Amino acid sequence: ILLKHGWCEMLKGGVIMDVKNVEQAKIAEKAGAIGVMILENIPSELRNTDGVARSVDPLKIEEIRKCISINVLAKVRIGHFVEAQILEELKVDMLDESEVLTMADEYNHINKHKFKTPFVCGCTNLGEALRRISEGASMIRTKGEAGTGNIIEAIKHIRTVNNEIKYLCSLDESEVYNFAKKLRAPIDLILLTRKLKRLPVVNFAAGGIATPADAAMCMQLGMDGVFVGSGIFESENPQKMASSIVMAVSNFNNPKILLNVSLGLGKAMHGNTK
Amino acid sequence: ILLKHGWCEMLKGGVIMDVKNVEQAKIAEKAGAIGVMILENIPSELRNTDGVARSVDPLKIEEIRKCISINVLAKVRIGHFVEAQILEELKVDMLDESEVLTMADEYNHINKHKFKTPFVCGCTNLGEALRRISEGASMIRTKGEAGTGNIIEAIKHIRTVNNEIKYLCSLDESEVYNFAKKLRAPIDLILLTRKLKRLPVVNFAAGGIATPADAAMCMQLGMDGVFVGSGIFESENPQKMASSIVMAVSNFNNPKILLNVSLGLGKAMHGNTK
Amino acid sequence: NDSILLKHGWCEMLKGGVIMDVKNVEQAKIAEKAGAIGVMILENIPSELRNTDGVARSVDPLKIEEIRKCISINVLAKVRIGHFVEAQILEELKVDMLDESEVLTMADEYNHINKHKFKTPFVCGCTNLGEALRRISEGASMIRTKGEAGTGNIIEAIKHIRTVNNEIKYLCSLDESEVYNFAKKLRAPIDLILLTRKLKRLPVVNFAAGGIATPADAAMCMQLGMDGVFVGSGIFESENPQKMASSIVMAVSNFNNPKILLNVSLGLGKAMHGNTKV
Amino acid sequence: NDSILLKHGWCEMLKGGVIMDVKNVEQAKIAEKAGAIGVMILENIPSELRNTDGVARSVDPLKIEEIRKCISINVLAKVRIGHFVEAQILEELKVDMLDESEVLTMADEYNHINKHKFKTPFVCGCTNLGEALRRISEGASMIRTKGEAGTGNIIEAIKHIRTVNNEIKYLCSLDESEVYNFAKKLRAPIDLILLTRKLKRLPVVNFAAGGIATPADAAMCMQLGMDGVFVGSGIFESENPQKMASSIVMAVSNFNNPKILLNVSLGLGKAMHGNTKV
Amino acid sequence: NDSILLKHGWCEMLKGGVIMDVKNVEQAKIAEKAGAIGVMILENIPSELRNTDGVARSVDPLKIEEIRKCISINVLAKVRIGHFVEAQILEELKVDMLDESEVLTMADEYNHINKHKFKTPFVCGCTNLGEALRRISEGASMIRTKGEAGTGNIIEAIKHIRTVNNEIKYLCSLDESEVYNFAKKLRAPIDLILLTRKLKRLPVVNFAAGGIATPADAAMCMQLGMDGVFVGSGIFESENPQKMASSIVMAVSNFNNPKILLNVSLGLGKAMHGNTKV
Ligand SMILES: *C[C@@H](O)[C@@H](O)[C@@H](O)COP(=O)(O)O
Ligand SMILES: *C[C@@H](O)[C@@H](O)[C@@H](O)COP(=O)(O)O
Ligand SMILES: *C[C@@H](O)[C@@H](O)[C@@H](O)COP(=O)(O)O
Ligand SMILES: *C[C@H](O)[C@@H](O)[C@@H](O)COP(=O)(O)O
Ligand SMILES: *C[C@H](O)[C@@H](O)[C@@H](O)COP(=O)(O)O
């Protein structure tokens, strides 16, 4: 039912961070992250490599879980219901069926209704978000452009979803059906979304967040929170970058604080344009 | 709710006939039609004309209704909710939001949930049928190729819907979501359709039915009934054509009867290939 | 500003009304007898102008003289797009309103009339919000849809109604920072975009126009939130012009009443045949 | 198997024969008087169906009744491709054979009739070996060429004859391992391909059909190894139908005899004008 | 028929099993120690063959001799597509099964091996139902998916599994009359299509093959209804081949048990890096 949602609700105002190990995960707990996202590799280092990126060894997760007390999350390949089965069995707080890993099924996503473990999925537009939720995702995030340290695609996606909801809310009761068709989304979720003027699940920004300014910007555009990986551990000073981002996120409307935690941060991740 | 469906159920095994007047409508009652479909013009005569085809003068309907006792049905232009409002007010047994009339709205169909009067809509494939029902249609029909007297498009549509339901029923629980997207149909009706191995409403053949053999063929392919217009009143002998088609439809698996009522029928409508 | 407010004051009184195209006195009295709030005087009705390749210009002023003294409702006329001199003449003839219309043959392909230089209010057509706002920016006091004039087919008018109406609602939802690129996209003047946003509607009276053949068509345009209707071809190319005219007016006045709408469609006669082009 | 063998037994008796299209009793007796082994009953002959855009369906059964009691030779009829119900009716009327024909307007664009569900034997058309074998796979008991029906032009029938006949000889030459990819290429059922290979011919009677206008045309089809001929338009649109009909039959019976072939072409009259399309 | 039934009897015993590619004795014992039901003997594993432009042929028979006397499980080998002579040699060497494989360099681009001429059973690859049925029609006793061999990426195998599995279910739903055009569309032999339809599955054992890098991948293929798995590159290019091999087998034997599946993935080591091509 919706204890899944209930669980996700506690994430509002939070930062989840990608970690490949214990020190990284400890740094994250010390920063005030509400959760870590455990990966073999963090997206920036997965970008010049043509290997098959799979969900992480479950031993790696246990090692890390016992050394921190915040929520523990992991990635699964799109469509790989067995990697999910294994991790659900292991008990994780949340699964991210993620495009950063190598797709396991080119046409079907995981039937997320078959799990007690809640799922987060990626999205770049309203129809896609609503399709992920129809399959049972409990939470959404933008895809951005993982590991590039460039906020632009994240911003595009945040606004695309927002503007489509606005167009949706501008439509009269009869116009919503043809819209549903165009979006290729289920009418029932389209109508609920219209009812709320937002997505019916929690909705985080993700991909390319490199500075506290980026994190706060996503928040000011109405996101419920943020995922950050590359931006922390590719930066000059990861603990301090991690800490500032969480502060930015907790105080996104406070320029005094945004200034303060932005001072003296060191070099952000170089990132990659193109 | 579903007294709408309930009403439609009584149509199973029936023939509805297009009439532009009283004699034609009387001929239809005498043939054993369960209903007439009242039009300014019948589709064959609407095909070499470039006029705007609208729903019929409501006086014409009253004139005809009082002179017969079978069900009375009329056409409305696609998207013309006011022509519907007027006819719902007049009390008709059923509305056909029909492609044979001149579309009034190029993007939106009538919000059929706003009416007590039940609606029939056209279709050529499963997704389209399910979109019409999502908008509140209580009954579906194929579009065929109205007024051409050629059964081929009707047959295509009957089988397209059937084969898509079969593909739908061949899919596992996770595969149904991507299918829904491809069909651009609402998941909830897709799942109900899958649950039944047929459309969730009554489903008639329509367009191009010219002989008892055609009518029975549609029936043998699993339709619940038939609409015929041009095939009757463009034929050499309309009363006898009307009578035979109803017999064919009531006895579609009976070759002895199909033969009998096909004998001596006169020339069917010339029709139009191309 | 005061001349703009003055013209807007005037146009408000058209709200809820029907304006009928006419060629002659005979037709204008049919219109007044029907309850039209005004007539729009034409050399030819749009259904006739589709059937010729002639140049279509504003009416001889004599015909506005002749008609106007036989009726007491508002008198309007069409001028060709960009033809500021045709307007100067009718401004001098004193007429209640001008329609710079795409139904006549354009006179200037790049410039509409600078409508600010006239005390007579203008109505212009639009198919979307930016176009409307551009027309209003040039001084139009009123807007109508274009639809497909003279075809008796409602489909384009309905598209145009919905497009503007959705664009207006969407614009109102945008954050104030997003309104600049949207203005660019619509190629509309920001300040008229900010005004629509503050009003939550078009800043002028806005009528449905094009292809209205029945009371159902008129009432539909009203149910989609229009303030009124223009009807040309659908009256005088129908079987019974008088009764078609009167029932359109009742439909516009009573657009949310099925009973009346039914009542006035009964035995109405054959509507304009129309043209659903080949 | 036994029903298949039973139908094949029946079709053999057509070998060496001519089957003539007819519309009426008058024509059917001309056919019987000519020595045709059967008539094929039609609402319209193919030359007439090229000159209309009408939907072309199987004949009223009454007309099969009327004709059949005036003649003693075989009675056949056409059903539309995929129209299994038209077939059910004629199966019930009892007729000697059905032709699921491309000359009538297709009823189903993806599926032919499941011919196995009928005791009446079917003939179908083909333009190549795979098509034939597919038709036989669906239960056809007999095959004919399509040619160009009703044009009076022999050129397509000859292509179709040669294509199948060469494909059959080539198939027989292939090594057994090569027969699988060839089956794929022809999109034919392997087992009917292995059967043709073991028989060194089509597994069914195979007639020439389409555009046969003279005894020379019929005899040519026979010299290319066909078992028989269908002729529609070439008889009753010729100058002297009776004499054209009788001389075709003699030509088919005597297809390797120049003297007779000469003899029956003499003073035959003007053959169908035909249509060598623009 | 009896030789076919005899071969099918044999292939059944592979059900539930894992077959592992090997190059040498050392690897084959790792496979036997892991519980593989057989090894597939190769000059090079597929991950190595992607990294060269060499011609890839069946293994030197000496290497089948050497390996076979050091293990007691089934011994299989690859022959090049269409290379019936390579098969004749291995048939003469007596090996438990042959794989006519697309991983080796094709020997004939138009013809696969006529597998009926061998007592040794063959396995072939497929990416859809028609292909499978064609392979079985040529005498394959067993089928596997192709997937993307040597890439360690499961995505193509999963597509291939689903396609065949859906096509099989759909075929079973079709009415008997629709089965002919579907056979044409798949370019498959009708009689093997009718057989799949009567069995409601492929008429042969059917394994998953290509890109299986983890126990999760193997178990997924089994949950999608496959009867078994082949694994090449994913074992011996992983960190700990022995433990990866044993845990794959347990996953295949216990594919519906999360607890075990978890248990055998724990601390497994780094799986083959793989290649998600540029
Ligand atoms: C300008 C005026 O004639 C409008 O009515 C025009 O756009 C549509 O008129 P009609 O009713 O003749 O289509
Ligand atoms: C079906 C039958 O009419 C055949 O003869 C046809 O394919 C050719 O007939 P025609 O001799 O009229 O060309
Ligand atoms: C032929 C055999 O090597 C199959 O495994 C091949 O198609 C896939 O192997 P891999 O596991 O190396 O991808
Ligand atoms: C998938 C992961 O949770 C998410 O962080 C990525 O999409 C973006 O991470 P960055 O490395 O871009 O911060
Ligand atoms: C719309 C109407 O109900 C339906 O009859 C048409 O689509 C087909 O009628 P025919 O004239 O083809 O019989």
Side-chain angles (χ1 to χ4, degrees):
Chain A
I1 194 80
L2 309 184
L3 45 55
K4 282 165 166 184
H5 285 194
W7 183 87
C8 301
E9 315 296 323
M10 312 173 93
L11 303 179
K12 287 196 187 93
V15 179
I16 296 173
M17 309 182 177
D18 287 26
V19 298
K20 54 171 161 90
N21 64 47
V22 297
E23 359 170 13
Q24 285 186 346
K26 268 161 145 148
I27 277 165
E29 194 176 11
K30 184 97 91 44
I34 45 156
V36 286
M37 172 64 78
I38 302 190
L39 311 179
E40 252 318 314
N41 293 286
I42 57 142
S44 62
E45 77 208 14
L46 280 170
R47 269 187 61 89
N48 276 108
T49 61
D50 297 324
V52 174
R54 307 184 189 81
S55 68
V56 69
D57 193 305
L59 201 69
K60 197 149 173 261
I61 292 169
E62 285 278 268
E63 271 160 23
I64 267 169
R65 168 142 61 183
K66 88 211 320 163
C67 287
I68 73 205
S69 62
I70 59 164
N71 285 292
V72 156
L73 297 71
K75 246 133 144 85
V76 297
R77 288 182 272 177
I78 283 173
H80 210 315
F81 48 85
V82 176
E83 288 188 330
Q85 290 173 1
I86 293 172
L87 291 188
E88 156 136 327
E89 181 57 22
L90 191 75
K91 254 68 141 303
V92 179
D93 296 302
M94 198 182 226
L95 296 166
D96 188 5
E97 185 183 19
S98 152
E99 70 291 339
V100 175
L101 303 193
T102 304
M103 203 156 58
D105 186 328
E106 90 167 81
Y107 302 120
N108 317 283
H109 282 76
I110 287 163
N111 189 340
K112 290 164 278 283
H113 302 288
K114 288 209 161 160
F115 299 82
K116 271 159 85 152
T117 320
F119 277 85
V120 56
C121 298
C123 100
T124 72
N125 61 78
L126 180 52
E128 188 169 11
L130 295 190
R131 286 192 293 275
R132 295 297 81 84
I133 298 160
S134 196
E135 299 152 0
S138 310
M139 170 184 177
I140 291 295
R141 69 171 156 74
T142 68
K143 298 195 190 185
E145 226 189 343
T148 69
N150 188 3
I151 200 39
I152 193 171
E153 296 307 307
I155 292 305
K156 189 213 250 213
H157 301 154
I158 290 165
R159 296 211 193 259
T160 299
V161 170
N162 280 4
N163 288 337
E164 290 178 329
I165 295 192
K166 311 230 217 194
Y167 182 85
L168 184 60
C169 294
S170 302
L171 264 24
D172 61 48
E173 258 165 286
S174 66
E175 295 169 305
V176 170
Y177 292 98
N178 185 61
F179 189 73
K181 163 152 148 279
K182 282 144 97 136
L183 277 214
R184 304 178 292 171
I187 192 55
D188 284 22
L189 291 175
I190 278 160
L191 285 163
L192 177 41
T193 305
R194 178 167 152 89
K195 205 173 87 143
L196 310 187
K197 309 179 205 148
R198 68 157 288 149
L199 247 26
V201 296
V202 172
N203 189 5
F204 267 41
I209 291 173
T211 66
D214 293 345
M217 181 171 176
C218 299
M219 301 312 273
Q220 300 189 185
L221 296 176
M223 303 312 281
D224 307 321
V226 152
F227 287 88
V228 197
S230 306
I232 291 172
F233 303 112
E234 292 303 325
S235 87
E236 206 200 313
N237 294 311
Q239 180 59 69
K240 178 145 95 145
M241 183 68 70
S243 288
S244 309
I245 290 181
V246 164
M247 293 282 284
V249 170
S250 304
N251 292 289
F252 69 91
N253 278 322
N254 194 326
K256 265 100 167 227
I257 299 198
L258 290 176
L259 180 53
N260 191 256
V261 305
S262 290
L263 286 162
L265 200 50
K267 289 148 69 269
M269 70 181 293
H270 186 66
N272 172 53
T273 187
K274 127 295 133 144
Chain B
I1 194 80
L2 309 184
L3 45 55
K4 282 165 166 184
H5 285 194
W7 183 87
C8 301
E9 315 296 323
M10 312 173 93
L11 303 179
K12 287 196 187 93
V15 179
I16 296 173
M17 309 182 177
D18 287 26
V19 298
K20 54 171 161 90
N21 64 47
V22 297
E23 359 170 13
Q24 285 186 346
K26 268 161 145 148
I27 277 165
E29 194 176 11
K30 184 97 91 44
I34 45 156
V36 286
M37 172 64 78
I38 302 190
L39 311 179
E40 252 318 314
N41 293 286
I42 57 142
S44 62
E45 77 208 14
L46 280 170
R47 269 187 61 89
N48 276 108
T49 61
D50 297 324
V52 174
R54 307 184 189 81
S55 68
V56 69
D57 193 305
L59 201 69
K60 197 149 173 261
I61 292 169
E62 285 278 268
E63 271 160 23
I64 267 169
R65 168 142 61 183
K66 88 211 320 163
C67 287
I68 73 205
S69 62
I70 59 164
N71 285 292
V72 156
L73 297 71
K75 246 133 144 85
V76 297
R77 288 182 272 177
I78 283 173
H80 210 315
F81 48 85
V82 176
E83 288 188 330
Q85 290 173 1
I86 293 172
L87 291 188
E88 156 136 327
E89 181 57 22
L90 191 75
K91 254 68 141 303
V92 179
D93 296 302
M94 198 182 226
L95 296 166
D96 188 5
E97 185 183 19
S98 152
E99 70 291 339
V100 175
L101 303 193
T102 304
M103 203 156 58
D105 186 328
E106 90 167 81
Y107 302 120
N108 317 283
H109 282 76
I110 287 163
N111 189 340
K112 290 164 278 283
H113 302 288
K114 288 209 161 160
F115 299 82
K116 271 159 85 152
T117 320
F119 277 85
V120 56
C121 298
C123 100
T124 72
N125 61 78
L126 180 52
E128 188 169 11
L130 295 190
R131 286 192 293 275
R132 295 297 81 84
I133 298 160
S134 196
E135 299 152 0
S138 310
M139 170 184 177
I140 291 295
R141 69 171 156 74
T142 68
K143 298 195 190 185
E145 226 189 343
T148 69
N150 188 3
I151 200 39
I152 193 171
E153 296 307 307
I155 292 305
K156 189 213 250 213
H157 301 154
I158 290 165
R159 296 211 193 259
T160 299
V161 170
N162 280 4
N163 288 337
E164 290 178 329
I165 295 192
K166 311 230 217 194
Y167 182 85
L168 184 60
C169 294
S170 302
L171 264 24
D172 61 48
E173 258 165 286
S174 66
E175 295 169 305
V176 170
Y177 292 98
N178 185 61
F179 189 73
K181 163 152 148 279
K182 282 144 97 136
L183 277 214
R184 304 178 292 171
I187 192 55
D188 284 22
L189 291 175
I190 278 160
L191 285 163
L192 177 41
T193 305
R194 178 167 152 89
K195 205 173 87 143
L196 310 187
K197 309 179 205 148
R198 68 157 288 149
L199 247 26
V201 296
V202 172
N203 189 5
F204 267 41
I209 291 173
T211 66
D214 293 345
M217 181 171 176
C218 299
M219 301 312 273
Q220 300 189 185
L221 296 176
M223 303 312 281
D224 307 321
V226 152
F227 287 88
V228 197
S230 306
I232 291 172
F233 303 112
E234 292 303 325
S235 87
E236 206 200 313
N237 294 311
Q239 180 59 69
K240 178 145 95 145
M241 183 68 70
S243 288
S244 309
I245 290 181
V246 164
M247 293 282 284
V249 170
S250 304
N251 292 289
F252 69 91
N253 278 322
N254 194 326
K256 265 100 167 227
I257 299 198
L258 290 176
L259 180 53
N260 191 256
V261 305
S262 290
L263 286 162
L265 200 50
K267 289 148 69 269
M269 70 181 293
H270 186 66
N272 172 53
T273 187
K274 127 295 133 144
Chain C
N1 198 45
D2 284 339
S3 27
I4 293 181
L5 284 162
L6 163 50
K7 287 156 170 170
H8 288 197
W10 193 83
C11 287
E12 298 315 305
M13 287 170 72
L14 310 182
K15 266 172 178 160
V18 181
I19 291 170
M20 294 181 190
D21 291 339
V22 304
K23 303 164 66 205
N24 65 30
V25 178
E26 305 76 275
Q27 290 191 147
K29 293 172 173 157
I30 286 167
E32 202 180 16
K33 190 161 295 227
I37 48 138
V39 295
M40 166 70 83
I41 301 178
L42 271 26
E43 189 53 20
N44 294 102
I45 73 175
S47 47
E48 308 167 343
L49 293 166
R50 286 180 53 91
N51 301 336
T52 74
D53 295 316
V55 184
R57 317 179 182 91
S58 49
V59 214
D60 192 308
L62 189 92
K63 292 190 54 45
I64 291 157
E65 280 200 359
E66 287 180 356
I67 285 163
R68 173 162 59 187
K69 69 187 45 161
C70 292
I71 61 149
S72 79
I73 54 163
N74 290 302
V75 164
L76 307 70
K78 273 162 148 75
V79 304
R80 292 182 271 172
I81 287 163
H83 212 311
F84 50 84
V85 174
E86 275 186 343
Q88 284 165 18
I89 282 156
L90 299 183
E91 164 95 358
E92 186 58 36
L93 186 53
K94 288 162 204 297
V95 296
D96 299 309
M97 165 173 268
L98 293 182
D99 179 347
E100 187 180 23
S101 181
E102 61 283 338
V103 172
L104 307 192
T105 309
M106 280 206 283
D108 188 336
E109 58 177 339
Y110 301 133
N111 304 295
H112 286 67
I113 295 168
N114 182 353
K115 290 163 275 293
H116 298 298
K117 293 192 154 175
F118 293 92
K119 286 172 231 166
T120 308
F122 278 73
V123 59
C124 296
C126 83
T127 76
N128 61 66
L129 182 54
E131 187 169 14
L133 292 183
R134 282 191 302 278
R135 290 297 80 76
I136 289 162
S137 180
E138 301 154 348
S141 305
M142 185 173 163
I143 294 293
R144 53 170 169 77
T145 68
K146 298 189 187 182
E148 221 170 33
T151 62
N153 189 352
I154 206 57
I155 197 181
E156 297 307 329
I158 293 301
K159 181 177 181 174
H160 302 161
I161 295 163
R162 294 191 180 282
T163 305
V164 163
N165 290 26
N166 295 340
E167 280 170 336
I168 282 172
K169 290 195 182 157
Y170 179 82
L171 167 61
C172 291
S173 75
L174 258 29
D175 66 36
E176 27 169 11
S177 85
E178 276 179 301
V179 177
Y180 299 101
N181 186 70
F182 183 77
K184 185 202 194 182
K185 288 295 171 320
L186 283 210
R187 309 165 297 167
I190 189 56
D191 86 300
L192 290 178
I193 287 181
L194 292 172
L195 211 222
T196 311
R197 193 175 158 86
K198 156 192 167 209
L199 299 193
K200 299 178 155 276
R201 52 172 180 283
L202 211 60
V204 296
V205 169
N206 183 14
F207 270 32
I212 300 180
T214 80
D217 297 354
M220 189 168 169
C221 295
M222 303 305 294
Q223 284 177 218
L224 291 172
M226 299 304 282
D227 305 318
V229 149
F230 293 86
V231 194
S233 312
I235 276 154
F236 299 112
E237 298 225 41
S238 83
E239 201 181 333
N240 303 310
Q242 188 53 262
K243 186 159 58 197
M244 181 68 71
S246 315
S247 40
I248 297 258
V249 158
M250 281 277 290
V252 165
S253 295
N254 295 285
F255 65 90
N256 271 316
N257 185 328
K259 295 153 181 188
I260 293 179
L261 286 178
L262 177 60
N263 181 37
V264 306
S265 313
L266 284 176
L268 183 55
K270 182 178 308 202
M272 73 176 295
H273 179 61
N275 181 78
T276 235
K277 181 270 198 70
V278 46
Chain D
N1 198 45
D2 284 339
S3 27
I4 293 181
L5 284 162
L6 163 50
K7 287 156 170 170
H8 288 197
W10 193 83
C11 287
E12 298 315 305
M13 287 170 72
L14 310 182
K15 266 172 178 160
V18 181
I19 291 170
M20 294 181 190
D21 291 339
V22 304
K23 303 164 66 205
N24 65 30
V25 178
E26 305 76 275
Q27 290 191 147
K29 293 172 173 157
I30 286 167
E32 202 180 16
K33 190 161 295 227
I37 48 138
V39 295
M40 166 70 83
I41 301 178
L42 271 26
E43 189 53 20
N44 294 102
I45 73 175
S47 47
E48 308 167 343
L49 293 166
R50 286 180 53 91
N51 301 336
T52 74
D53 295 316
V55 184
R57 317 179 182 91
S58 49
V59 214
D60 192 308
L62 189 92
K63 292 190 54 45
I64 291 157
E65 280 200 359
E66 287 180 356
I67 285 163
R68 173 161 59 187
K69 69 187 45 161
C70 292
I71 61 149
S72 79
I73 54 163
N74 290 302
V75 164
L76 307 70
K78 273 162 148 75
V79 304
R80 292 182 271 172
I81 287 163
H83 212 311
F84 50 84
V85 174
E86 275 186 343
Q88 284 165 18
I89 282 156
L90 299 183
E91 164 95 358
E92 186 58 36
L93 186 53
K94 288 162 204 297
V95 296
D96 299 309
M97 165 173 268
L98 293 182
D99 179 347
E100 187 180 23
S101 181
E102 61 283 338
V103 172
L104 307 192
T105 309
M106 280 206 283
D108 188 336
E109 58 177 339
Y110 301 133
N111 304 295
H112 286 67
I113 295 168
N114 182 353
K115 290 163 275 293
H116 298 298
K117 293 192 154 175
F118 293 92
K119 286 172 231 166
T120 308
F122 278 73
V123 59
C124 296
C126 83
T127 76
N128 61 66
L129 182 54
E131 187 169 14
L133 292 183
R134 282 191 302 278
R135 290 297 80 76
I136 289 162
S137 180
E138 301 154 348
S141 305
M142 185 173 163
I143 294 293
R144 53 170 169 77
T145 68
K146 298 189 187 182
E148 221 170 33
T151 62
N153 189 352
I154 206 57
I155 197 181
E156 297 307 329
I158 293 301
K159 181 177 181 174
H160 302 161
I161 295 163
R162 294 191 180 282
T163 305
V164 163
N165 290 26
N166 295 340
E167 280 170 336
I168 282 172
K169 291 195 182 157
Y170 179 82
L171 167 61
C172 291
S173 75
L174 258 29
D175 66 36
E176 27 169 11
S177 85
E178 276 179 301
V179 177
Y180 299 101
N181 186 70
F182 183 77
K184 185 202 194 182
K185 288 295 171 320
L186 283 210
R187 309 165 297 167
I190 189 56
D191 86 300
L192 290 178
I193 287 181
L194 292 172
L195 211 222
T196 311
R197 193 175 158 86
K198 156 192 167 209
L199 299 193
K200 299 178 155 276
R201 52 172 180 283
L202 211 60
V204 296
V205 169
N206 183 14
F207 270 32
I212 300 180
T214 80
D217 297 354
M220 189 168 169
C221 295
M222 303 305 294
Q223 284 177 218
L224 291 172
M226 299 304 282
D227 305 318
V229 149
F230 293 86
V231 194
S233 312
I235 276 154
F236 299 112
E237 298 225 41
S238 83
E239 201 181 333
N240 303 310
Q242 188 53 262
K243 186 159 58 197
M244 181 68 71
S246 315
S247 40
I248 297 258
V249 158
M250 281 277 290
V252 165
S253 295
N254 295 285
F255 65 90
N256 271 316
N257 185 328
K259 295 153 181 188
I260 293 179
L261 286 178
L262 177 60
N263 181 37
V264 306
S265 313
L266 284 176
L268 183 55
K270 182 178 308 202
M272 73 176 295
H273 179 61
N275 181 78
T276 235
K277 181 270 198 70
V278 46
Chain E
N1 198 45
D2 284 339
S3 27
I4 293 181
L5 284 162
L6 163 50
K7 287 156 170 170
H8 288 197
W10 193 83
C11 287
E12 298 315 305
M13 287 170 72
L14 310 182
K15 266 172 178 160
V18 181
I19 291 170
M20 294 181 190
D21 291 339
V22 304
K23 303 164 66 205
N24 65 30
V25 178
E26 305 76 275
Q27 290 191 147
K29 293 172 173 157
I30 286 167
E32 202 180 16
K33 190 161 295 227
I37 48 138
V39 295
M40 166 70 83
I41 301 178
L42 271 26
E43 189 53 20
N44 294 102
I45 73 175
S47 47
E48 308 167 343
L49 293 166
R50 286 180 53 91
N51 301 336
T52 74
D53 295 316
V55 184
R57 317 179 182 91
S58 49
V59 214
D60 192 308
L62 189 92
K63 292 190 54 45
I64 291 157
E65 280 200 359
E66 287 180 356
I67 285 163
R68 173 162 59 187
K69 69 187 45 161
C70 292
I71 61 149
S72 79
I73 54 163
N74 290 302
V75 164
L76 307 70
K78 273 162 148 75
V79 304
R80 292 182 271 172
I81 287 163
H83 212 311
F84 50 84
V85 174
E86 275 186 343
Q88 284 165 18
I89 282 156
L90 299 183
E91 164 95 358
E92 186 58 36
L93 186 53
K94 288 162 204 297
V95 296
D96 299 309
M97 165 173 268
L98 293 182
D99 179 347
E100 187 180 23
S101 181
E102 61 283 338
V103 172
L104 307 192
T105 309
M106 280 206 283
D108 188 336
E109 58 177 339
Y110 301 133
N111 304 295
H112 286 67
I113 295 168
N114 182 353
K115 290 163 275 293
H116 298 298
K117 293 192 154 175
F118 293 92
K119 286 172 231 166
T120 308
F122 278 73
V123 59
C124 296
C126 83
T127 76
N128 61 66
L129 182 54
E131 187 169 14
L133 292 183
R134 282 191 302 278
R135 290 297 80 76
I136 289 162
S137 180
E138 301 154 348
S141 305
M142 185 173 163
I143 294 293
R144 53 170 169 77
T145 68
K146 298 189 187 182
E148 221 170 33
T151 62
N153 189 352
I154 206 57
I155 197 181
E156 297 307 329
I158 293 301
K159 181 177 181 174
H160 302 161
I161 295 163
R162 294 191 180 282
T163 305
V164 163
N165 290 26
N166 295 340
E167 280 170 336
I168 282 172
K169 290 195 182 157
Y170 179 82
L171 167 61
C172 291
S173 75
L174 258 29
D175 66 36
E176 27 169 11
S177 85
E178 276 179 301
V179 177
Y180 299 101
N181 186 70
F182 183 77
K184 185 202 194 182
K185 288 295 171 320
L186 283 210
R187 309 165 297 167
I190 189 56
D191 86 300
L192 290 178
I193 287 181
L194 292 172
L195 211 222
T196 311
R197 193 175 158 86
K198 156 192 167 209
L199 299 193
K200 299 178 155 276
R201 52 172 180 283
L202 211 60
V204 296
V205 169
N206 183 14
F207 270 32
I212 300 180
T214 80
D217 297 354
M220 189 168 169
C221 295
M222 303 305 294
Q223 284 177 218
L224 291 172
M226 299 304 282
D227 305 318
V229 149
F230 293 86
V231 194
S233 312
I235 276 154
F236 299 112
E237 298 225 41
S238 83
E239 201 181 333
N240 303 310
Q242 188 53 262
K243 186 159 58 197
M244 181 68 71
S246 315
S247 40
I248 297 258
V249 158
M250 281 277 290
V252 165
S253 295
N254 295 285
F255 65 90
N256 271 316
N257 185 328
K259 295 153 181 188
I260 293 179
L261 286 178
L262 177 60
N263 181 37
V264 306
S265 313
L266 284 176
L268 183 55
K270 182 178 308 202
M272 73 176 295
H273 179 61
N275 181 78
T276 235
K277 181 270 198 70
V278 46

